[PDB]
């Protein structure tokens, strides 16, 4: 019963996207790479690469309901540089395709881990592909992305480096918008170590719980895609947090940034910084790096 109206802001033709090169295959649904022609109407014959989300052969009534609403809430949220944006939809002349932005460099964790140096550095503390400015940029872009998402009333259970995608130009796109207007982001491709205490235990997901997770994401960035809480089983991580345990400062991380990580991990949600403040703090660092 696929009879959605033709939304003239978002409807894009079938004839104009060329499919193939599958990027991810979840349960009952899949994301494939595709070349789209004139996704910018200002350049109407010019081509560009995109990511197309669709249902698998094993189709369902509820899953088509989820994919439709997901696509509807995406255009409700609006565009931002640091989120995976909706590009177009194909509703009428065939099955549902939701066209979104493609990130050529994979997720942030994968991006970071692939660009690691082969071992330890010359010094324990204190120019290449993962420069300090590049890492500060990564952190900043995600903060901007979350700041936007929160202004659009988007809540997450958590946020991790695997949820952030990286484009050819190292622009960080958050892939999971989360829950918004009673519709979840379905992934066609629990994380206890990322979740804030209230999210783990009381299942209260707020802006303050997103900040905690961002703290863990920062620690991920500055360990070049490190696994959080190393050598600690997921069982009885919670006990450690209850006692006051937090992760140490990574080998190559300024105390300024570690300050921010610890600030994100305050037990009281009100003691944690807002994403407005995280953006202020990260921009000051970025500026400091560019100076002299």
Tab-separated table of C-alpha atoms in Angstrom:
chain	number	residue	atom	x	y	z
A	1	UNK	CA	0.000	0.000	0.000
A	2	UNK	CA	2.792	2.460	-0.970
A	3	UNK	CA	0.780	5.597	-1.922
A	4	UNK	CA	2.728	8.509	-0.371
A	5	UNK	CA	2.061	11.977	-1.841
A	6	UNK	CA	4.563	13.481	-4.303
A	7	UNK	CA	6.485	15.873	-2.032
A	8	UNK	CA	7.839	18.389	-4.588
A	9	UNK	CA	10.683	19.533	-2.296
A	10	UNK	CA	12.012	15.944	-1.980
A	11	UNK	CA	10.865	13.721	-4.881
A	12	UNK	CA	13.743	12.658	-7.176
A	13	UNK	CA	13.342	10.420	-10.269
A	14	UNK	CA	14.245	6.689	-10.606
A	15	UNK	CA	15.796	7.118	-14.083
A	16	UNK	CA	18.329	9.510	-12.555
A	17	UNK	CA	20.053	7.322	-9.888
A	18	UNK	CA	22.271	4.374	-10.949
A	19	UNK	CA	22.572	1.722	-8.208
A	20	UNK	CA	25.233	-0.884	-7.283
A	21	UNK	CA	28.265	-1.086	-4.956
A	22	UNK	CA	26.476	-2.130	-1.699
A	23	UNK	CA	27.719	-0.305	1.450
A	24	UNK	CA	25.805	-2.183	4.174
A	25	UNK	CA	23.156	-4.886	4.673
A	26	UNK	CA	21.242	-5.025	7.977
A	27	UNK	CA	18.215	-7.125	8.924
A	28	UNK	CA	15.316	-6.640	6.440
A	29	UNK	CA	16.968	-3.530	4.844
A	30	UNK	CA	20.129	-2.309	3.077
A	31	UNK	CA	22.146	0.782	2.093
A	32	UNK	CA	23.688	0.823	-1.406
A	33	UNK	CA	26.046	3.321	-3.083
A	34	UNK	CA	24.767	5.021	-6.242
A	35	UNK	CA	25.640	7.746	-8.744
A	36	UNK	CA	22.928	10.438	-8.927
A	37	UNK	CA	22.740	12.963	-11.804
A	38	UNK	CA	21.860	16.565	-10.906
A	39	UNK	CA	21.221	16.099	-7.199
A	40	UNK	CA	22.072	19.805	-7.261
A	41	UNK	CA	19.535	21.313	-9.750
A	42	UNK	CA	21.967	24.239	-10.327
A	43	UNK	CA	24.259	21.594	-11.901
A	44	UNK	CA	21.466	19.465	-13.511
A	45	UNK	CA	23.555	17.172	-15.786
A	46	UNK	CA	26.545	16.998	-13.364
A	47	UNK	CA	26.889	13.710	-11.431
A	48	UNK	CA	27.621	12.911	-7.782
A	49	UNK	CA	27.927	9.846	-5.515
A	50	UNK	CA	25.189	9.202	-2.906
A	51	UNK	CA	23.935	6.573	-0.425
A	52	UNK	CA	20.534	4.963	-1.082
A	53	UNK	CA	18.627	3.226	1.742
A	54	UNK	CA	15.992	0.609	0.839
A	55	UNK	CA	14.113	-2.493	1.986
A	56	UNK	CA	15.434	-6.002	1.222
A	57	UNK	CA	13.524	-8.726	-0.682
A	58	UNK	CA	12.164	-10.028	2.671
A	59	UNK	CA	9.831	-7.017	2.977
A	60	UNK	CA	7.599	-6.176	5.955
A	61	UNK	CA	4.623	-3.886	6.642
A	62	UNK	CA	6.141	-2.358	9.808
A	63	UNK	CA	9.640	-1.864	8.295
A	64	UNK	CA	8.223	0.142	5.336
A	65	UNK	CA	6.331	2.133	7.995
A	66	UNK	CA	9.644	2.760	9.850
A	67	UNK	CA	11.601	3.707	6.712
A	68	UNK	CA	8.868	6.149	5.618
A	69	UNK	CA	8.642	7.884	9.023
A	70	UNK	CA	12.464	7.941	9.330
A	71	UNK	CA	12.606	9.756	5.979
A	72	UNK	CA	9.767	12.094	7.088
A	73	UNK	CA	11.502	13.063	10.362
A	74	UNK	CA	14.785	13.666	8.470
A	75	UNK	CA	13.264	16.519	6.409
A	76	UNK	CA	11.563	17.770	9.596
A	77	UNK	CA	14.972	18.037	11.329
A	78	UNK	CA	16.490	20.077	8.470
A	79	UNK	CA	20.021	20.192	7.076
A	80	UNK	CA	23.311	20.734	8.937
A	81	UNK	CA	26.901	20.381	7.750
A	82	UNK	CA	27.797	17.834	10.442
A	83	UNK	CA	24.854	15.390	10.050
A	84	UNK	CA	24.177	12.852	7.266
A	85	UNK	CA	21.552	14.815	5.329
A	86	UNK	CA	18.504	13.728	3.336
A	87	UNK	CA	19.086	14.375	-0.390
A	88	UNK	CA	15.928	13.029	-2.051
A	89	UNK	CA	13.265	10.320	-2.082
A	90	UNK	CA	11.833	7.941	-4.720
A	91	UNK	CA	8.241	7.104	-3.723
A	92	UNK	CA	5.899	6.713	-6.713
A	93	UNK	CA	7.253	4.633	-9.630
A	94	UNK	CA	8.655	1.683	-7.585
A	95	UNK	CA	9.789	0.683	-4.043
A	96	UNK	CA	10.940	3.192	-1.388
A	97	UNK	CA	14.452	4.639	-1.831
A	98	UNK	CA	15.672	7.221	0.695
A	99	UNK	CA	18.650	9.081	-0.803
A	100	UNK	CA	21.178	10.335	1.791
A	101	UNK	CA	24.767	11.668	1.808
A	102	UNK	CA	27.726	9.342	1.253
A	103	UNK	CA	30.845	9.348	3.435
A	104	UNK	CA	33.797	8.030	1.404
A	105	UNK	CA	36.140	7.529	4.405
A	106	UNK	CA	33.859	5.197	6.457
A	107	UNK	CA	33.007	5.758	10.134
A	108	UNK	CA	35.201	7.876	12.439
A	109	UNK	CA	36.527	4.856	14.393
A	110	UNK	CA	37.561	3.080	11.151
A	111	UNK	CA	38.997	6.362	9.792
A	112	UNK	CA	41.056	6.904	12.965
A	113	UNK	CA	42.244	3.290	13.339
A	114	UNK	CA	43.347	3.031	9.674
A	115	UNK	CA	45.454	6.221	9.971
A	116	UNK	CA	47.271	5.132	13.202
A	117	UNK	CA	51.085	5.215	13.317
A	118	UNK	CA	52.757	1.778	13.402
A	119	UNK	CA	53.677	1.929	17.148
A	120	UNK	CA	54.734	4.243	20.036
A	121	UNK	CA	56.023	7.809	19.370
A	122	UNK	CA	59.489	9.290	20.118
A	123	UNK	CA	58.204	10.833	23.396
A	124	UNK	CA	55.497	9.620	25.859
A	125	UNK	CA	53.529	12.942	25.772
A	126	UNK	CA	53.124	15.999	23.506
A	127	UNK	CA	51.909	17.088	10.901
A	128	UNK	CA	50.731	13.808	9.251
A	129	UNK	CA	47.170	12.531	8.554
A	130	UNK	CA	46.069	12.595	12.234
A	131	UNK	CA	47.486	16.006	13.219
A	132	UNK	CA	46.447	17.573	16.522
A	133	UNK	CA	44.421	20.209	14.607
A	134	UNK	CA	42.748	17.394	12.586
A	135	UNK	CA	41.760	15.661	15.854
A	136	UNK	CA	40.521	18.961	17.367
A	137	UNK	CA	38.547	19.547	14.150
A	138	UNK	CA	36.944	16.084	14.423
A	139	UNK	CA	35.871	16.760	18.005
A	140	UNK	CA	34.537	20.242	17.113
A	141	UNK	CA	32.481	19.070	14.104
A	142	UNK	CA	30.732	16.366	16.156
A	143	UNK	CA	29.947	18.932	18.908
A	144	UNK	CA	28.406	21.263	16.303
A	145	UNK	CA	26.418	18.321	14.907
A	146	UNK	CA	25.063	17.383	18.339
A	147	UNK	CA	24.324	21.020	19.209
A	148	UNK	CA	22.159	21.179	16.074
A	149	UNK	CA	20.429	17.827	16.735
A	150	UNK	CA	19.501	18.924	20.278
A	151	UNK	CA	18.003	22.168	18.917
A	152	UNK	CA	15.801	19.895	16.719
A	153	UNK	CA	14.602	17.854	19.769
A	154	UNK	CA	16.633	14.690	18.964
A	155	UNK	CA	17.427	12.272	21.836
A	156	UNK	CA	19.870	9.315	21.729
A	157	UNK	CA	20.542	6.396	23.997
A	158	UNK	CA	24.236	7.054	23.184
A	159	UNK	CA	26.792	8.535	20.770
A	160	UNK	CA	30.004	6.774	19.615
A	161	UNK	CA	32.716	7.149	16.954
A	162	UNK	CA	31.100	4.317	14.941
A	163	UNK	CA	27.942	6.515	14.640
A	164	UNK	CA	29.941	9.423	13.100
A	165	UNK	CA	30.862	9.166	9.403
A	166	UNK	CA	33.698	10.979	7.594
A	167	UNK	CA	33.567	12.449	4.073
A	168	UNK	CA	36.339	12.784	1.451
A	169	UNK	CA	37.042	16.305	2.848
A	170	UNK	CA	37.178	15.139	6.530
A	171	UNK	CA	33.749	16.621	7.337
A	172	UNK	CA	32.182	14.691	10.247
A	173	UNK	CA	28.562	13.593	9.629
A	174	UNK	CA	26.576	12.118	12.571
A	175	UNK	CA	24.689	9.129	11.083
A	176	UNK	CA	22.250	8.339	13.925
A	177	UNK	CA	19.723	11.140	14.598
A	178	UNK	CA	18.178	8.880	17.308
A	179	UNK	CA	14.552	9.270	18.424
A	180	UNK	CA	12.629	12.348	17.200
A	181	UNK	CA	8.823	12.894	16.929
A	182	UNK	CA	8.280	9.269	18.078
A	183	UNK	CA	10.280	7.666	15.226
A	184	UNK	CA	13.690	5.962	15.592
A	185	UNK	CA	16.646	5.992	13.212
A	186	UNK	CA	16.798	2.510	11.645
A	187	UNK	CA	20.362	1.279	10.871
A	188	UNK	CA	20.855	-0.909	7.750
A	189	UNK	CA	24.580	-1.720	8.250
A	190	UNK	CA	23.862	-2.203	24.042
A	191	UNK	CA	27.027	0.005	23.943
A	192	UNK	CA	27.312	0.084	27.756
A	193	UNK	CA	30.788	1.719	27.832
A	194	UNK	CA	29.404	4.857	26.079
A	195	UNK	CA	26.176	5.314	28.047
A	196	UNK	CA	25.880	7.778	30.942
A	197	UNK	CA	24.862	6.284	34.343
A	198	UNK	CA	21.223	7.463	34.180
A	199	UNK	CA	20.867	5.953	30.667
A	200	UNK	CA	22.359	2.587	31.747
A	201	UNK	CA	20.253	2.205	34.881
A	202	UNK	CA	17.246	4.615	35.051
A	203	UNK	CA	16.834	4.732	31.204
A	204	UNK	CA	16.666	8.548	31.262
A	205	UNK	CA	18.093	9.881	27.990
A	206	UNK	CA	18.647	13.649	27.945
A	207	UNK	CA	20.990	16.284	26.471
A	208	UNK	CA	23.111	15.763	29.575
A	209	UNK	CA	23.420	12.022	28.823
A	210	UNK	CA	24.513	12.862	25.246
A	211	UNK	CA	27.336	15.009	26.708
A	212	UNK	CA	28.636	12.062	28.790
A	213	UNK	CA	28.774	9.972	25.629
A	214	UNK	CA	30.554	12.816	23.807
A	215	UNK	CA	33.212	12.663	26.562
A	216	UNK	CA	33.776	8.986	25.641
A	217	UNK	CA	33.801	9.979	21.946
A	218	UNK	CA	36.517	12.600	22.688
A	219	UNK	CA	38.582	9.937	24.466
A	220	UNK	CA	38.005	7.742	21.384
A	221	UNK	CA	39.314	10.510	19.077
A	222	UNK	CA	42.451	11.254	21.099
A	223	UNK	CA	43.323	7.545	21.455
A	224	UNK	CA	42.981	7.220	17.628
A	225	UNK	CA	39.952	4.918	17.840
A	226	UNK	CA	40.740	3.236	21.146
A	227	UNK	CA	38.366	0.826	22.872
A	228	UNK	CA	37.077	2.601	26.025
A	229	UNK	CA	37.727	1.263	29.543
A	230	UNK	CA	40.487	-1.160	28.390
A	231	UNK	CA	40.774	-4.521	30.170
A	232	UNK	CA	37.511	-3.944	32.079
A	233	UNK	CA	34.695	-6.418	31.330
A	234	UNK	CA	31.327	-4.774	30.599
A	235	UNK	CA	29.946	-6.593	33.665
A	236	UNK	CA	31.042	-4.567	36.735
A	237	UNK	CA	32.061	-1.469	34.731
A	238	UNK	CA	29.068	0.087	36.459
A	239	UNK	CA	30.460	-0.624	39.967
A	240	UNK	CA	33.688	1.201	39.010
A	241	UNK	CA	31.706	4.282	37.861
A	242	UNK	CA	29.642	4.184	41.097
A	243	UNK	CA	32.879	4.274	43.136
A	244	UNK	CA	34.212	7.275	41.107
A	245	UNK	CA	36.453	5.587	38.473
A	246	UNK	CA	36.986	7.366	35.176
A	247	UNK	CA	39.306	6.696	32.201
A	248	UNK	CA	42.882	8.052	32.348
A	249	UNK	CA	44.319	10.801	30.155
A	250	UNK	CA	45.437	9.284	26.809
A	251	UNK	CA	49.239	9.253	26.119
A	252	UNK	CA	49.008	12.206	23.689
A	253	UNK	CA	46.248	14.439	24.983
A	254	UNK	CA	46.508	17.969	26.462
A	255	UNK	CA	45.121	18.464	30.034
A	256	UNK	CA	42.757	21.083	28.512
A	257	UNK	CA	40.990	18.326	26.504
A	258	UNK	CA	41.182	15.852	29.400
A	259	UNK	CA	39.526	18.576	31.465
A	260	UNK	CA	36.617	18.470	29.008
A	261	UNK	CA	36.418	14.656	29.146
A	262	UNK	CA	36.254	14.724	32.963
A	263	UNK	CA	33.704	17.553	32.842
A	264	UNK	CA	31.528	15.409	30.530
A	265	UNK	CA	31.760	12.541	33.063
A	266	UNK	CA	30.460	14.334	36.165
A	267	UNK	CA	27.989	12.129	38.035
A	268	UNK	CA	25.430	14.936	38.418
A	269	UNK	CA	23.923	15.785	34.965
A	270	UNK	CA	23.733	19.519	35.831
A	271	UNK	CA	27.494	19.622	36.593
A	272	UNK	CA	28.217	18.478	32.993
A	273	UNK	CA	28.801	21.087	30.262
A	274	UNK	CA	26.239	21.845	27.543
A	275	UNK	CA	27.102	21.288	23.861
A	276	UNK	CA	27.070	25.102	23.508
A	277	UNK	CA	29.924	25.166	26.058
A	278	UNK	CA	31.742	22.213	24.459
A	279	UNK	CA	31.648	24.099	21.121
A	280	UNK	CA	33.012	27.252	22.817
A	281	UNK	CA	35.777	25.195	24.453
A	282	UNK	CA	36.756	23.235	21.328
A	283	UNK	CA	36.792	26.357	19.132
A	284	UNK	CA	39.189	28.048	21.601
A	285	UNK	CA	41.550	25.049	21.198
A	286	UNK	CA	41.222	25.088	17.376
A	287	UNK	CA	42.033	28.810	17.437
A	288	UNK	CA	44.998	28.205	19.787
A	289	UNK	CA	46.374	25.609	17.349
A	290	UNK	CA	46.129	27.950	14.321
A	291	UNK	CA	47.974	30.745	16.192
A	292	UNK	CA	51.806	30.964	15.804
